[PDB]
Design a protein around this nucleic acid. Sequence first.
DNA 1: CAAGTAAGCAGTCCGCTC
DNA 2: GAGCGGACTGCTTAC
DNA 3: TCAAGTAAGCAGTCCGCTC
DNA 4: GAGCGGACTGCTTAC
Lengths: 899, 901
Amino acid sequence: GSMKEFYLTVEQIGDSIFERYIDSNGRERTREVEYKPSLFAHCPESQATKYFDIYGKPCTRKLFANMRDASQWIKRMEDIGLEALGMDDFKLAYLSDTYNYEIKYDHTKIRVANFDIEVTSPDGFPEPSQAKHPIDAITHYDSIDDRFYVFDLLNSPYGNVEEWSIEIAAKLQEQGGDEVPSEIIDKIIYMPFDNEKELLMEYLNFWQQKTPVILTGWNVESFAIPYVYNRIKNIFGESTAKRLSPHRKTRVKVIENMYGSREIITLFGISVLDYIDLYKKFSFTNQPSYSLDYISEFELNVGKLKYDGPISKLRESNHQRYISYNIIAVYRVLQIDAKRQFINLSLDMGYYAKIQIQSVFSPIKTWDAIIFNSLKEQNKVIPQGRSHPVQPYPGAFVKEPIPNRYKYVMSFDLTSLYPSIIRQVNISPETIAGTFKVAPLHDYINAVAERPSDVYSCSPNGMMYYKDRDGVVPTEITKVFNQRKEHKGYMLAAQRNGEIIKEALHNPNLSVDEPLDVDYRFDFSDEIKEKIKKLSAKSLNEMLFRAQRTEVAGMTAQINRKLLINSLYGALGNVWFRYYDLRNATAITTFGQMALQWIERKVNEYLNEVCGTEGEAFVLYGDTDSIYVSADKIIDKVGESKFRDTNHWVDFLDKFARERMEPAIDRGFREMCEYMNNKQHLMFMDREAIAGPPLGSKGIGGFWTGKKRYALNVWDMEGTRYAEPKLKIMGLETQKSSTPKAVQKALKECIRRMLQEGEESLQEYFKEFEKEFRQLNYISIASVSSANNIAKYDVGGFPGPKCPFHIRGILTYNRAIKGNIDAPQVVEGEKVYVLPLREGNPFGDKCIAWPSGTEITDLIKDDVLHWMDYTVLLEKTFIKPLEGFTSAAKLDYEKKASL
Amino acid sequence: MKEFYLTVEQIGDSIFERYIDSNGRERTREVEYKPSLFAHCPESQATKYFDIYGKPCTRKLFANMRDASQWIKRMEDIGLEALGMDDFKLAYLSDTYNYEIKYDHTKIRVANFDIEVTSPDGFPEPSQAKHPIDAITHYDSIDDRFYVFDLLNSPYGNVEEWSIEIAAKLQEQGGDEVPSEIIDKIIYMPFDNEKELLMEYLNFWQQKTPVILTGWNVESFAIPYVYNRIKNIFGESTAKRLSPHRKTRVKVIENMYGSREIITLFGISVLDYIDLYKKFSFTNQPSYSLDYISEFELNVGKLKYDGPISKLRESNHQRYISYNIIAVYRVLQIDAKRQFINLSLDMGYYAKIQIQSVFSPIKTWDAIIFNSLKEQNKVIPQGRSHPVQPYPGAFVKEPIPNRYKYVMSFDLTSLYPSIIRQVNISPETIAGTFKVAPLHDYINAVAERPSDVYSCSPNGMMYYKDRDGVVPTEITKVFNQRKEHKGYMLAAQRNGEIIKEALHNPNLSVDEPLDVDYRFDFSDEIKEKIKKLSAKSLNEMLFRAQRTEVAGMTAQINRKLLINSLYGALGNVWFRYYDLRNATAITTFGQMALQWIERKVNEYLNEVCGTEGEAFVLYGDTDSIYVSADKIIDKVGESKFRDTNHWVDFLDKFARERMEPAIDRGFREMCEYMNNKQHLMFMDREAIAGPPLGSKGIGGFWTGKKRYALNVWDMEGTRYAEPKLKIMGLETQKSSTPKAVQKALKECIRRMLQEGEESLQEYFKEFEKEFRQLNYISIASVSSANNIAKYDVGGFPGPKCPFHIRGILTYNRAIKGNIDAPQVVEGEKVYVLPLREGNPFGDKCIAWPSGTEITDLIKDDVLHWMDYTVLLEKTFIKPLEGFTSAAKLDYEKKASLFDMF
DNA sequence: CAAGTAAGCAGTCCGCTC
DNA sequence: GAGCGGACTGCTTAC
DNA sequence: TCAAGTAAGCAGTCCGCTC
DNA sequence: GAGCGGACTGCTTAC
Ligand SMILES: O=c1ccn([C@H]2C[C@H](O)[C@@H](COP(=O)(O)NP(=O)(O)OP(=O)(O)O)O2)c(=O)[nH]1
Ligand SMILES: Nc1nc2c(ncn2[C@@H]2O[C@H](COP(=O)(O)O)[C@@H](O)[C@H]2O)c(=O)[nH]1
Ligand SMILES: Nc1nc2c(ncn2[C@@H]2O[C@H](COP(=O)(O)O)[C@@H](O)[C@H]2O)c(=O)[nH]1
Ligand SMILES: [Ca+2]
Ligand SMILES: [Ca+2]
Ligand SMILES: [Mg+2]
């Protein structure tokens, strides 16, 4: 045929590679291949051939008859103390050999399955490890069929019920409907069942015919998959359960972390990407709850499906709603992926690197595969992975700021610093050239230490690198970095475009039209800008949605390519990385420290010079690769009173940054490259934030409380001129998932008023929030914490020594729900709401905690509401942080007592 | 006399010390000890103080100890080394006791107590102490009395008083059989209520406050249970009266699998005898129950009783209390034998540490070295951080599995301490590095000479010869002190046979014991004056003779443990003097030395026997070579010998006169090659092994590394009346192997080595026939039980569940809902039995706590559904197949008609 | 489960000042 | 006795 | 298993492979 | 289904 072939899944099972793939005729195929791998040994110079290790030292290829021999050869070589070289993960070698080209994949041919089960349980949480309760609903969406297959148990030990009606389902809540979105109604294939055996046999047969390649859902890896597997195992036997693998192989793998161990089913020939796990790695959020209800609301702004009574009883109560719920749960994940596009990101990284798609969770595995593939094309031979001891190594510099208001601020930030350092210095395992005598870092920062080398590219940690060779790490990181730049470009264009539409919405023309057909990844032409100011509110609001969805797509693509390249840096400091080397890891961080503090000096020198001052500190702060510059003296040299409005002084500072500061900064960094004799100048420092108060207001513009704790009123970020000023808040309690939701909102308004409006406005809102606090929903004002090691501090159900406050809260909960089976149980390693309790409370302790994202069981709710300590809660979560902000910013959130 | 500390603690800025004063009276003092640490100087300010690298240091006296510790952090942040003893109570001890401490154990209050706690609802967790203490027995070393506290009334029993006369009687005369030697040492005290009992004991504790506190599980059970039980009634401050500094604290003991809690009683030294036993016994026991260790050590039986322990006090309060008393006595009997308390006192006072710190070689050795360096106005380096990582260890030759008829073994003397001294290894004696040939090239002496200037190890490390290392120096002094104190012990032995040959017909007179030193051979003056003494005054002179002997032994055992301890510390990141390159210099030097002298011995024997490239060295491990003597015996004829002693004499003569000089020459060449500071690779002949002359015995066999058996006639010049089996590694040696299978396999080996294949085949039949009639405990396997919970999946085995843990889960299901049923303890050991298919327990094995009978609830069913066939095959036949395969014989003449069925 | 370090605040324990 | 600060754990950010 | 070290054996589980 | 051996965990030696 005329289609390029690409793998779907791959496994090693003994001496066979089992591959699912799409063939030249674009059909799904499977094949068992007795892969003949090759490894490599350091040979003498005379025996030379086309194969050299990364240091250029020659190797002979050793072809093996099968894979189990190769692995044995490695163990034997490890006894002799001789290095066994090459790709020891044979299915990477196979993927590499079979697909010796850039893979173009067609996602319309990749079966992506999306499923959720319901298990009615009278006696608490149905543990998937023993699946002792009937499965009474499955919904399974298939991306090739674009259908929702619904499987519905009518008869179970916990009730006989009637068929679900798609007719009822479609309707609105009011006329007994379930509000199943109408755009999936014609995509639902319903199948009822008299017994569970029939339901399960039907789903397995169905699974044989529509075998997922990508399997996803919410908590599918930890609940649904193990629960279905063991439910089928317990009824029919193990052999029948293993039909969930198209190669009939499963492992009951033990996943370990620092607080215990859990069980997961590996289905060989399937790629499980649990969406909860994609969300945690790729979303760059930290959420107080990871329930689908909660993530659905945050991402889609779509509310919970309400239901009366406990989940354990919904089926008897309203099976019609039970089944609709199951169906929408599946849809929710598809909605979330449409927005975030984590499946597309996964496929993209998994095919770029030639790895199993689930290996996108592991940057070590992704990069091992990329660097392997890269070295193999040059007939070069990767090192044996070695054992190394974990030990600390130093990281970034963070300047101690003077706690203060800062009125006018411009920030600058190095482009992809650590990847840029890797490229600039030529930092690679095989580019190490030697070392030099290390002066103190201060001496390099101030340029009074002797030039390290006239021959080699240097870091100030004393490492020297060849300028005449290209390192594999520089080469391969450059490629991913360029992708990241391309996608960031699209993101910022989408961002700029959004503000134009936002601006056009202020004066919406009352007309009837349609959205304009544009690509949001590129700055609107003057022409399109003209046609936008003649649109209706309806048409503009649809275009704003399309822009923001384009920005989110850019954000996912760019920030996760940045994670991958930053994770190659990190991989250098991870003992399990093939190319682990603390000299190279600390070459990067130590260079970074010099670069930041070097450019701090250079910017101070330059601004003293423009402002006719001496030894003034203009750089008030920086962290890792950022500087924050006080612009007060720049504004004052013009005279604040000559500016027409805010956008006038913003324009001026924008021009000053670009035309005066950027050239000075590049001069500074070119001199630093020369001092270190680096391969390429790549220390590029873009203007980010222009921040200050609205002109003529008593806003303070910004404050720092200390390291990693500040707020700026931002008018322009990285060339995006905002319709309305945006708060950039880093580190403060507004940004922390542990801070109660209502208090996040309260503190942010406190900050907005401080920066924008000033002390009197702040003092006005403080009084306001104090008044409405005790009438706020109890969940909205509860603290959140992760609960680790509940058992370490559980001493016959009471706090042991050094018991953390949130753990105390959980022990208090556990005591109060003892011998109530249907009470919701706190899960080790998950998150809890926390409330303090007034002295004299019935729970016998000073706080209580319950599972985050839930109402507290009705058994105890009323007593909790009655004994909530509102005074301590307000003091701890609101007033204490606010006192931190206001002491920093040198104003008051209240006037003290006056008779 | 001279003043010695009892206990010491840092509480903030106050050292609290209990001590004996010059009058011999127990005292306390709080002290605001002003510590001193040290910093690096430029030459200008140099004074008497130098760090171990020589470089000069300023003393920095602090007002309190907390600013010294803060200064440390200040200095750390700065990246400046802060020299000297960070453990301030050691510096104090050093300052306060600047002389060899002479201690008097009759002035040290050693208490050991045991409590009983009647409980219906299973094990009474000490962390909650939710049941009445209904018995305590508390022996005091100074009073020589057992104080019995006996609760007469409780929620579980209103019972009568305990009769010391019914106690004394024999178990036939309705008695408890309480030893007669203690009956007149018991101070009984019944109580009508527990608060009364508890208050008195707390007040009795207040007079007679333990310095050394011991017992069996006192640390993990008895102490916390007494503490918390008193807290929970009388409140915290009252419970803190168990510290004589009213300062107590709850400690978090963390291991690889979870954590427990103990009560640190500040101002008491707790040496739980279970923990002393584990550390100092160098056994591995299938159980560490008092009852099991008592049986093993003393041969004293099992304190017996009917029904559960929860219903003993009610059923037979009279036996209950006797049990409680005899429990405490058992531990005294055990310490009478092993003397671990006295050894502990000796080492602590030697090192000038808390006595409880003898548990730690790192602490003990840090203190010893600090005190010596202080004396030379030198300054210990700061504790530094090092990444936990492996380093290479001993060499072990791969043996050819075979019978080996005639074997002679040679062992290097204290190898690792000797390499440290030989190569002068210390952090401050590191001088540089060299190009490293493969180890084989150093073994074969074809590698080029590392250095002409520095003492070398072949891991590439080079050391100054022109100075003595801190570590070498210190080890040499403890070596020298061992010799010192064994001399003293033997001189006091020889002096004690004099006095006991002057007691023959003692001059009936009125004299007084001579004021003599017993650590030296009596001058002929004293020998004369000793005969003209009375019986009284001789017998006192012999009591002092023998206490000089016991003290000499205690001290030299002490020194030996320290010598063998030190290498361990050197390999541990938390050791001040830890260096990785130093660790692997020690061990790689050891590898060379063994394989060097293997080459040398092979070369010499080939020359002596007129052969070439014959392998004489069949095996070696770390510090040992085993030499095949067959060809040596064949020079003279096997037939030419009169008896076994003749050829043993012959090999003893040949080793000492021929092989040892050849070995000394070998090791001398090696010393020059590595340019070492002194030659200390000394290799004594150890075993001579073979069959009885004219027998069909095979003499010995190897199955592999760390698995062999020798019939030994002579060890280090001691000629045995009867041959002794030296068995290493084999299942006879392993605590996991059933007691009865240990004995059977040993008799199998004995017959193989001494008698031959047919004798083996005769015994095999006999043990097979008797196996099914043996007691179930005697044929049960033993295993430690770690991570039970990990593999427990709703009461059933999880993935990769180990066999013994499957056994524990079977037991748990079987005793579920029986609260009075004995529970398996996480980290403790279990008996394991396989079960025949279709058994009611629902699995293929069961496990229960070791050193116990399995609970009567299930005992009958286990006995019925025991799989004897699987048991015999796994524990006995499979290992025997290993031995006989290696030795190239068979435990059966042929396969049975049944096996060919 | 899945690359890295720097560093903030909440809370416990405990000894010190007040 | 109350309040504080240092040494610590636990959690959660910023980069 | 609070409290020195590494080398290396066997029992048993999982699993592929061969009979 | 049983047996073997390799890759692993668990345990217990030797020194
Ligand atoms: O998760 C992270 C974030 C940052 N870092 C390090 C390396 C990286 O270069 C730097 C991040 O600084 P920024 O957050 O400003 N991002 P970066 O400079 O990489 O890229 P850019 O500024 O172009 O977005 O800190 C990590 O190692 N891991
Ligand atoms: N060049 C190279 N080939 C490797 C390495 N590890 C495994 N191989 C395998 O060795 C073979 C190389 O043969 P070639 O591609 O030159 O015909 C392929 O099967 C490839 O997967 C490695 O590190 N370098
Ligand atoms: N010599 C020495 N004394 C130390 C060291 N660490 C702490 N010290 C203490 O410093 C003081 C020195 O007093 P000196 O021995 O000079 O009379 C003593 O109290 C001693 O305990 C050390 O490393 N060397
Ligand atoms: Ca940056
Ligand atoms: Ca047959
Ligand atoms: Mg027989």
